[PDB]
Amino acid sequence: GTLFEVVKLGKSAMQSVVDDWIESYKQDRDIALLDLINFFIQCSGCRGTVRIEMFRNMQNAEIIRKMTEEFDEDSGDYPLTMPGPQWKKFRSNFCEFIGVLIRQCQYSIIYDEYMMDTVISLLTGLSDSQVRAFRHTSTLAAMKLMTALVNVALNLSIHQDNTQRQYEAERNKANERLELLLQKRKELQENQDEIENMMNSIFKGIFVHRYRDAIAEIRAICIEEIGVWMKMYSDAFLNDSYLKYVGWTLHDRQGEVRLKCLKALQSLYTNRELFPKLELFTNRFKDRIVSMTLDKEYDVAVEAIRLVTLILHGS
């Protein structure tokens, strides 16, 4: 509207486009989802365009295969790997768009059993593509999508604690307000369960396959993000089964990937309340971690020394 209302609100670049897409989704879900599908296609450098009759008739496997036939066979460059200057902030805007999209949808659209299933199915199929541009773009999107979903689960816990205290405060006084708080408590837990199913689909369908990708940057993206999930949501992500992925990646050939493993572990060991969960991991990968304090790469060795110092101070 007016200059004052626009300045007072101060919508970011990515929130302005997300709110426009959400309103487009309320008018026609298929057209908005088609625009979102073509977004991830065009972000990968693909020049193809999915049409609405393709979206309504074809499966993701056929759609992706048709989009695969629309790449420049000579060039392997795509927006996530171009130097600039039109691509300096694209990666930052790409990651921010995903977090803003899910944050603005977290109270209704995310639970409609159509939007998230379409996004995750698309990103899962693109993550298994032979085209590096498809794997890189979809995996980065899926990793940021998981982190956005963790933040949704974090906000749900806050709403669950508020509803619980409002229930017990009203209980210590059955009317309509009590049964309404009982129903919201049941509904919020169902939201948590549905968000966890989405996180499991991304983890089992994308992460466990992309963390050992042939491209080093794709491995670095997966390792960096699982460390974020382990710090934000340790009850579900910090376990011996998931720590095996970080432990096995300590032996990576590329220094950029080993560097991300160490910094991921640093954020876990720097929290004293997480040390009992890391005891078995420390004993299993002690020799590899201490051996990296003299890694052939200087930047890796510095962070391994920082990690060992945190391990020692924790005990």
Author numbering: 85 to 257, 263 to 404
The authors write:
We have designed constructs of STAG1’s N-terminal and central region encompassing interaction regions I and II, and IV, respectively, and obtained crystal structures in both the presence and absence of the corresponding RAD21 peptides. We determined the structures of the N-terminal region of human STAG1, encompassing residues 86–420, in the absence and presence of a RAD21 peptide to 2.0 and 2.4 Å, respectively. As expected based on the degree of sequence homology (73% identities over equivalent regions), the structure is highly similar to STAG2 (∼1.3 Å RMSD).
The complex consists of a tripartite ring comprising SMC1, SMC3, and RAD21 (also called SCC1 or Mcd1), which associates with a conserved peripheral fourth subunit that, in human somatic cells, is represented by two paralogs of the Scc3/STAG protein family, STAG1 or STAG2. STAG1/2 HEAT repeat proteins bind to the RAD21 subunit of the core cohesin ring and are required for the dynamic association of the complex with chromatin. The STAG1 protein is composed of HEAT repeats, a tandem repeat structural motif composed of two α helices linked by a short loop. STAG1 and STAG2, therefore, function redundantly in somatic mammalian cells to mediate sister chromatid cohesion, an event essential for cell viability during proliferation.
